[PDB]
Every structure is written in structure tokens, then in C-alpha cells.
Amino acid sequence: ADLSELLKEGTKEAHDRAENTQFVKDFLKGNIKKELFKLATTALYFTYSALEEEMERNKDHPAFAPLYFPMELHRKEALTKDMEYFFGENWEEQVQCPKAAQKYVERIHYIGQNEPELLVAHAYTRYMGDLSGGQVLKKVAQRALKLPSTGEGTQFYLFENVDNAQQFKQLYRARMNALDLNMKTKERIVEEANKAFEYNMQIFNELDQ
């Protein structure tokens, strides 16, 4: 079957575990105060910074190059703005990567440097979720925190260079299923995605405390 298919089925339960953590629920209800939201944005910054560094490094690698979309997908810049908006211009001296997130960052660097054919598992669990879910999460954060409607602190959640999010998701999926992969590597990808989803849950749990 198709890689995108194995991932939708092989990760549904890990995706749901992550989706049902106490952090996520109180997020969707508007009950996450500013300081916790900043800590969560801090974790997105180090996480996406590592992931996009590894995708840049492997931008020509045949098992990944078709999915390299810096203009459409990359989040480091938008996350830099949000960090500047919440912390001030000296933000980098003020933050430190959360410990659970440091474990995800280490995993991302390992994959991009030793098994780049697995990098797709990490881009899928992050960017495809962000594309379809974005605008919903954006408004919740703007309300709960009285964020300016001009978009400050919330730019992570807007993909300005993607004009039809459900259309880009199709393009991305089509390219993924066209990758030259045997069934061995494909199910490696599927369990690497489950790995990634569990890393997300570990970060949500560290954030709940």
C-alpha cells in the first residue's frame, strides 16, 4: 500500500494519545496562561529549528529532496518573531530548551545525520498537522491570551506562502508516496512517526506540570 496510508493507520493511536493529553485539552478550552504558552512556543522553536536544520542538510538527498519546501513549510522565522514578541529582542539569552524537548531535538539530529530516509517521518508528524489544524489553534491562542489580531505571537500558525492548505497537503502526500522505498523502510518510517508522536506527548506532559 501507499506510505501515506500506512502512516494514517499505523499512527492513529499514538496521534490520539498525544491529542488527549491534559495540555492539549486545556489549550482547546482556552485555559493556558501566557507564561505556559511561552514555554510551549520555546519548545516549538528549538524543535523546528533542529528539524529544519536537518532538512536543509539533506536538501539534496534522494530519499528526502522531493519534500524540501523551505518557502511553503519552514517555521523557524515565524517562530523567531513570536519569540521576539513574547520575550523581547534579547529572547535567546532568556530561554532554554525544555528537557523533554532536548530529547526530541537529539533524536531529530541523529535521524538527519545517520538515517535521512527517516526524516520524512518527522516532517509528516509536524507540518501536515500544522497545515490543516493551524487556523483553529491560532484563534484560540489569540482569544485566551488577548493577542493582537495583527498576528503577533501567533505567526507559527499561519502558512502565508501556502494558498490552499488542503491542496498543498495533497501535493505533499503524492510526492511522499512516489518515493522509491521498499516495504522495510516504509514501516521503519511508520514506527519513526510513532516515535515522533510519543516525543510530542512527552513534551505535552512536561508542559502540564
mmCIF file with all atom_site columns, N, CA and C in Angstrom, residues 7 10-15 17-18 47 100 103-108 110-111 115 118 121-122 125-126 187-203:
data_model
loop_
_atom_site.group_PDB
_atom_site.id
_atom_site.type_symbol
_atom_site.label_atom_id
_atom_site.label_alt_id
_atom_site.label_comp_id
_atom_site.label_asym_id
_atom_site.label_entity_id
_atom_site.label_seq_id
_atom_site.pdbx_PDB_ins_code
_atom_site.Cartn_x
_atom_site.Cartn_y
_atom_site.Cartn_z
_atom_site.occupancy
_atom_site.B_iso_or_equiv
_atom_site.pdbx_formal_charge
_atom_site.auth_seq_id
_atom_site.auth_comp_id
_atom_site.auth_asym_id
_atom_site.auth_atom_id
_atom_site.pdbx_PDB_model_num
ATOM 1   N N  . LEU A 1 7   ? 0.885  5.390  7.262  1.00 0.00 ? 7   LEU A N  1
ATOM 2   C CA . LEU A 1 7   ? 1.066  6.382  8.312  1.00 0.00 ? 7   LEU A CA 1
ATOM 3   C C  . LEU A 1 7   ? -0.264 6.801  8.926  1.00 0.00 ? 7   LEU A C  1
ATOM 4   N N  . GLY A 1 10  ? -1.122 3.335  10.865 1.00 0.00 ? 10  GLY A N  1
ATOM 5   C CA . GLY A 1 10  ? -0.108 2.945  11.831 1.00 0.00 ? 10  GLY A CA 1
ATOM 6   C C  . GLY A 1 10  ? 0.175  3.966  12.919 1.00 0.00 ? 10  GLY A C  1
ATOM 7   N N  . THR A 1 11  ? -0.328 5.199  12.795 1.00 0.00 ? 11  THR A N  1
ATOM 8   C CA . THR A 1 11  ? -0.076 6.225  13.801 1.00 0.00 ? 11  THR A CA 1
ATOM 9   C C  . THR A 1 11  ? -1.338 6.777  14.447 1.00 0.00 ? 11  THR A C  1
ATOM 10  N N  . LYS A 1 12  ? -2.524 6.270  14.087 1.00 0.00 ? 12  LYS A N  1
ATOM 11  C CA . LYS A 1 12  ? -3.770 6.838  14.605 1.00 0.00 ? 12  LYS A CA 1
ATOM 12  C C  . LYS A 1 12  ? -3.812 6.814  16.130 1.00 0.00 ? 12  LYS A C  1
ATOM 13  N N  . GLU A 1 13  ? -3.339 5.729  16.743 1.00 0.00 ? 13  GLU A N  1
ATOM 14  C CA . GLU A 1 13  ? -3.444 5.614  18.192 1.00 0.00 ? 13  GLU A CA 1
ATOM 15  C C  . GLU A 1 13  ? -2.411 6.483  18.910 1.00 0.00 ? 13  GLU A C  1
ATOM 16  N N  . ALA A 1 14  ? -1.156 6.483  18.443 1.00 0.00 ? 14  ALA A N  1
ATOM 17  C CA . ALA A 1 14  ? -0.170 7.407  19.003 1.00 0.00 ? 14  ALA A CA 1
ATOM 18  C C  . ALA A 1 14  ? -0.588 8.861  18.786 1.00 0.00 ? 14  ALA A C  1
ATOM 19  N N  . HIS A 1 15  ? -1.133 9.176  17.605 1.00 0.00 ? 15  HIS A N  1
ATOM 20  C CA . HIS A 1 15  ? -1.649 10.521 17.359 1.00 0.00 ? 15  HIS A CA 1
ATOM 21  C C  . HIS A 1 15  ? -2.754 10.879 18.348 1.00 0.00 ? 15  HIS A C  1
ATOM 22  N N  . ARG A 1 17  ? -3.327 9.483  21.470 1.00 0.00 ? 17  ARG A N  1
ATOM 23  C CA . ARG A 1 17  ? -2.751 9.645  22.803 1.00 0.00 ? 17  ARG A CA 1
ATOM 24  C C  . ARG A 1 17  ? -2.239 11.064 22.997 1.00 0.00 ? 17  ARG A C  1
ATOM 25  N N  . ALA A 1 18  ? -1.407 11.532 22.062 1.00 0.00 ? 18  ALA A N  1
ATOM 26  C CA . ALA A 1 18  ? -0.939 12.912 22.098 1.00 0.00 ? 18  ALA A CA 1
ATOM 27  C C  . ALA A 1 18  ? -2.105 13.896 22.131 1.00 0.00 ? 18  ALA A C  1
ATOM 28  N N  . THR A 1 47  ? 12.584 22.756 18.615 1.00 0.00 ? 47  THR A N  1
ATOM 29  C CA . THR A 1 47  ? 12.207 21.572 17.850 1.00 0.00 ? 47  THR A CA 1
ATOM 30  C C  . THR A 1 47  ? 12.260 21.840 16.353 1.00 0.00 ? 47  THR A C  1
ATOM 31  N N  . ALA A 1 100 ? 12.539 17.448 28.037 1.00 0.00 ? 100 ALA A N  1
ATOM 32  C CA . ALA A 1 100 ? 11.893 16.518 27.116 1.00 0.00 ? 100 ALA A CA 1
ATOM 33  C C  . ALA A 1 100 ? 12.098 16.950 25.669 1.00 0.00 ? 100 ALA A C  1
ATOM 34  N N  . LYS A 1 103 ? 15.424 16.006 24.304 1.00 0.00 ? 103 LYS A N  1
ATOM 35  C CA . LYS A 1 103 ? 15.460 14.626 23.833 1.00 0.00 ? 103 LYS A CA 1
ATOM 36  C C  . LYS A 1 103 ? 14.936 14.511 22.401 1.00 0.00 ? 103 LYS A C  1
ATOM 37  N N  . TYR A 1 104 ? 13.861 15.239 22.061 1.00 0.00 ? 104 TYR A N  1
ATOM 38  C CA . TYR A 1 104 ? 13.365 15.208 20.680 1.00 0.00 ? 104 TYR A CA 1
ATOM 39  C C  . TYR A 1 104 ? 14.390 15.804 19.723 1.00 0.00 ? 104 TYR A C  1
ATOM 40  N N  . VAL A 1 105 ? 14.994 16.935 20.111 1.00 0.00 ? 105 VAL A N  1
ATOM 41  C CA . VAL A 1 105 ? 15.999 17.594 19.279 1.00 0.00 ? 105 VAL A CA 1
ATOM 42  C C  . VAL A 1 105 ? 17.162 16.654 18.998 1.00 0.00 ? 105 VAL A C  1
ATOM 43  N N  . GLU A 1 106 ? 17.619 15.936 20.029 1.00 0.00 ? 106 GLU A N  1
ATOM 44  C CA . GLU A 1 106 ? 18.696 14.970 19.847 1.00 0.00 ? 106 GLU A CA 1
ATOM 45  C C  . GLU A 1 106 ? 18.290 13.879 18.856 1.00 0.00 ? 106 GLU A C  1
ATOM 46  N N  . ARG A 1 107 ? 17.063 13.357 18.991 1.00 0.00 ? 107 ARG A N  1
ATOM 47  C CA . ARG A 1 107 ? 16.566 12.353 18.049 1.00 0.00 ? 107 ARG A CA 1
ATOM 48  C C  . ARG A 1 107 ? 16.524 12.889 16.620 1.00 0.00 ? 107 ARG A C  1
ATOM 49  N N  . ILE A 1 108 ? 16.066 14.135 16.441 1.00 0.00 ? 108 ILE A N  1
ATOM 50  C CA . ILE A 1 108 ? 15.990 14.744 15.111 1.00 0.00 ? 108 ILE A CA 1
ATOM 51  C C  . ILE A 1 108 ? 17.378 14.847 14.483 1.00 0.00 ? 108 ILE A C  1
ATOM 52  N N  . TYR A 1 110 ? 20.039 13.049 15.207 1.00 0.00 ? 110 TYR A N  1
ATOM 53  C CA . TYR A 1 110 ? 20.506 11.704 14.904 1.00 0.00 ? 110 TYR A CA 1
ATOM 54  C C  . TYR A 1 110 ? 19.943 11.220 13.579 1.00 0.00 ? 110 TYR A C  1
ATOM 55  N N  . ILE A 1 111 ? 18.630 11.379 13.379 1.00 0.00 ? 111 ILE A N  1
ATOM 56  C CA . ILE A 1 111 ? 17.987 10.873 12.163 1.00 0.00 ? 111 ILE A CA 1
ATOM 57  C C  . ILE A 1 111 ? 18.554 11.573 10.936 1.00 0.00 ? 111 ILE A C  1
ATOM 58  N N  . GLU A 1 115 ? 20.246 8.443  9.316  1.00 0.00 ? 115 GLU A N  1
ATOM 59  C CA . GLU A 1 115 ? 19.186 7.744  8.585  1.00 0.00 ? 115 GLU A CA 1
ATOM 60  C C  . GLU A 1 115 ? 18.268 8.762  7.920  1.00 0.00 ? 115 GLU A C  1
ATOM 61  N N  . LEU A 1 118 ? 14.620 8.553  7.014  1.00 0.00 ? 118 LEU A N  1
ATOM 62  C CA . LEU A 1 118 ? 13.576 8.602  8.021  1.00 0.00 ? 118 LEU A CA 1
ATOM 63  C C  . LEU A 1 118 ? 13.129 10.023 8.339  1.00 0.00 ? 118 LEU A C  1
ATOM 64  N N  . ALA A 1 121 ? 9.434  10.941 8.207  1.00 0.00 ? 121 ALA A N  1
ATOM 65  C CA . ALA A 1 121 ? 8.559  10.644 9.335  1.00 0.00 ? 121 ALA A CA 1
ATOM 66  C C  . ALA A 1 121 ? 8.425  11.849 10.257 1.00 0.00 ? 121 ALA A C  1
ATOM 67  N N  . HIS A 1 122 ? 9.500  12.619 10.411 1.00 0.00 ? 122 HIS A N  1
ATOM 68  C CA . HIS A 1 122 ? 9.437  13.765 11.315 1.00 0.00 ? 122 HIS A CA 1
ATOM 69  C C  . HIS A 1 122 ? 8.752  14.966 10.677 1.00 0.00 ? 122 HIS A C  1
ATOM 70  N N  . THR A 1 125 ? 4.734  14.270 10.769 1.00 0.00 ? 125 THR A N  1
ATOM 71  C CA . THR A 1 125 ? 4.023  14.396 12.032 1.00 0.00 ? 125 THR A CA 1
ATOM 72  C C  . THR A 1 125 ? 3.899  15.850 12.459 1.00 0.00 ? 125 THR A C  1
ATOM 73  N N  . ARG A 1 126 ? 4.815  16.706 12.014 1.00 0.00 ? 126 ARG A N  1
ATOM 74  C CA . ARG A 1 126 ? 4.726  18.111 12.384 1.00 0.00 ? 126 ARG A CA 1
ATOM 75  C C  . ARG A 1 126 ? 3.953  18.922 11.337 1.00 0.00 ? 126 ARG A C  1
ATOM 76  N N  . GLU A 1 187 ? 7.824  0.793  6.753  1.00 0.00 ? 187 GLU A N  1
ATOM 77  C CA . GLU A 1 187 ? 7.365  0.546  8.114  1.00 0.00 ? 187 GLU A CA 1
ATOM 78  C C  . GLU A 1 187 ? 8.352  1.058  9.158  1.00 0.00 ? 187 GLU A C  1
ATOM 79  N N  . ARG A 1 188 ? 9.628  1.215  8.792  1.00 0.00 ? 188 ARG A N  1
ATOM 80  C CA . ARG A 1 188 ? 10.547 1.979  9.628  1.00 0.00 ? 188 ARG A CA 1
ATOM 81  C C  . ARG A 1 188 ? 10.072 3.419  9.753  1.00 0.00 ? 188 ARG A C  1
ATOM 82  N N  . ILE A 1 189 ? 9.683  4.014  8.624  1.00 0.00 ? 189 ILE A N  1
ATOM 83  C CA . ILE A 1 189 ? 9.107  5.353  8.628  1.00 0.00 ? 189 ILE A CA 1
ATOM 84  C C  . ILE A 1 189 ? 7.893  5.403  9.546  1.00 0.00 ? 189 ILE A C  1
ATOM 85  N N  . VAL A 1 190 ? 7.014  4.403  9.445  1.00 0.00 ? 190 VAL A N  1
ATOM 86  C CA . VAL A 1 190 ? 5.793  4.395  10.248 1.00 0.00 ? 190 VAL A CA 1
ATOM 87  C C  . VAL A 1 190 ? 6.119  4.340  11.736 1.00 0.00 ? 190 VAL A C  1
ATOM 88  N N  . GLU A 1 191 ? 7.087  3.511  12.131 1.00 0.00 ? 191 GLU A N  1
ATOM 89  C CA . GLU A 1 191 ? 7.387  3.486  13.558 1.00 0.00 ? 191 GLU A CA 1
ATOM 90  C C  . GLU A 1 191 ? 8.204  4.700  13.991 1.00 0.00 ? 191 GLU A C  1
ATOM 91  N N  . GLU A 1 192 ? 8.993  5.293  13.086 1.00 0.00 ? 192 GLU A N  1
ATOM 92  C CA . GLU A 1 192 ? 9.655  6.549  13.433 1.00 0.00 ? 192 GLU A CA 1
ATOM 93  C C  . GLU A 1 192 ? 8.634  7.654  13.678 1.00 0.00 ? 192 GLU A C  1
ATOM 94  N N  . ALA A 1 193 ? 7.534  7.644  12.926 1.00 0.00 ? 193 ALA A N  1
ATOM 95  C CA . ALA A 1 193 ? 6.464  8.611  13.157 1.00 0.00 ? 193 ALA A CA 1
ATOM 96  C C  . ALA A 1 193 ? 5.801  8.389  14.508 1.00 0.00 ? 193 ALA A C  1
ATOM 97  N N  . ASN A 1 194 ? 5.578  7.123  14.875 1.00 0.00 ? 194 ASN A N  1
ATOM 98  C CA . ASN A 1 194 ? 5.063  6.824  16.206 1.00 0.00 ? 194 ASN A CA 1
ATOM 99  C C  . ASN A 1 194 ? 6.033  7.302  17.280 1.00 0.00 ? 194 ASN A C  1
ATOM 100 N N  . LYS A 1 195 ? 7.338  7.076  17.066 1.00 0.00 ? 195 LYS A N  1
ATOM 101 C CA . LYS A 1 195 ? 8.375  7.647  17.926 1.00 0.00 ? 195 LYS A CA 1
ATOM 102 C C  . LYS A 1 195 ? 8.184  9.150  18.075 1.00 0.00 ? 195 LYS A C  1
ATOM 103 N N  . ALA A 1 196 ? 8.022  9.849  16.944 1.00 0.00 ? 196 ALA A N  1
ATOM 104 C CA . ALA A 1 196 ? 7.862  11.297 16.975 1.00 0.00 ? 196 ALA A CA 1
ATOM 105 C C  . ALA A 1 196 ? 6.621  11.695 17.758 1.00 0.00 ? 196 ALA A C  1
ATOM 106 N N  . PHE A 1 197 ? 5.503  10.995 17.530 1.00 0.00 ? 197 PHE A N  1
ATOM 107 C CA . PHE A 1 197 ? 4.274  11.329 18.246 1.00 0.00 ? 197 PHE A CA 1
ATOM 108 C C  . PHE A 1 197 ? 4.449  11.143 19.748 1.00 0.00 ? 197 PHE A C  1
ATOM 109 N N  . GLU A 1 198 ? 5.202  10.112 20.154 1.00 0.00 ? 198 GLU A N  1
ATOM 110 C CA . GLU A 1 198 ? 5.442  9.896  21.575 1.00 0.00 ? 198 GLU A CA 1
ATOM 111 C C  . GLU A 1 198 ? 6.312  11.006 22.151 1.00 0.00 ? 198 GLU A C  1
ATOM 112 N N  . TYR A 1 199 ? 7.306  11.466 21.381 1.00 0.00 ? 199 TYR A N  1
ATOM 113 C CA . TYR A 1 199 ? 8.087  12.631 21.795 1.00 0.00 ? 199 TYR A CA 1
ATOM 114 C C  . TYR A 1 199 ? 7.189  13.849 22.008 1.00 0.00 ? 199 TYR A C  1
ATOM 115 N N  . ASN A 1 200 ? 6.216  14.065 21.118 1.00 0.00 ? 200 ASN A N  1
ATOM 116 C CA . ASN A 1 200 ? 5.272  15.162 21.319 1.00 0.00 ? 200 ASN A CA 1
ATOM 117 C C  . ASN A 1 200 ? 4.499  14.995 22.622 1.00 0.00 ? 200 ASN A C  1
ATOM 118 N N  . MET A 1 201 ? 4.029  13.776 22.901 1.00 0.00 ? 201 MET A N  1
ATOM 119 C CA . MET A 1 201 ? 3.310  13.545 24.150 1.00 0.00 ? 201 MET A CA 1
ATOM 120 C C  . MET A 1 201 ? 4.201  13.831 25.361 1.00 0.00 ? 201 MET A C  1
ATOM 121 N N  . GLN A 1 202 ? 5.452  13.349 25.340 1.00 0.00 ? 202 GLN A N  1
ATOM 122 C CA . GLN A 1 202 ? 6.377  13.637 26.435 1.00 0.00 ? 202 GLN A CA 1
ATOM 123 C C  . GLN A 1 202 ? 6.589  15.139 26.636 1.00 0.00 ? 202 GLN A C  1
ATOM 124 N N  . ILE A 1 203 ? 6.489  15.932 25.567 1.00 0.00 ? 203 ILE A N  1
ATOM 125 C CA . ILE A 1 203 ? 6.670  17.367 25.731 1.00 0.00 ? 203 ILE A CA 1
ATOM 126 C C  . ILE A 1 203 ? 5.408  17.996 26.300 1.00 0.00 ? 203 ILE A C  1
#
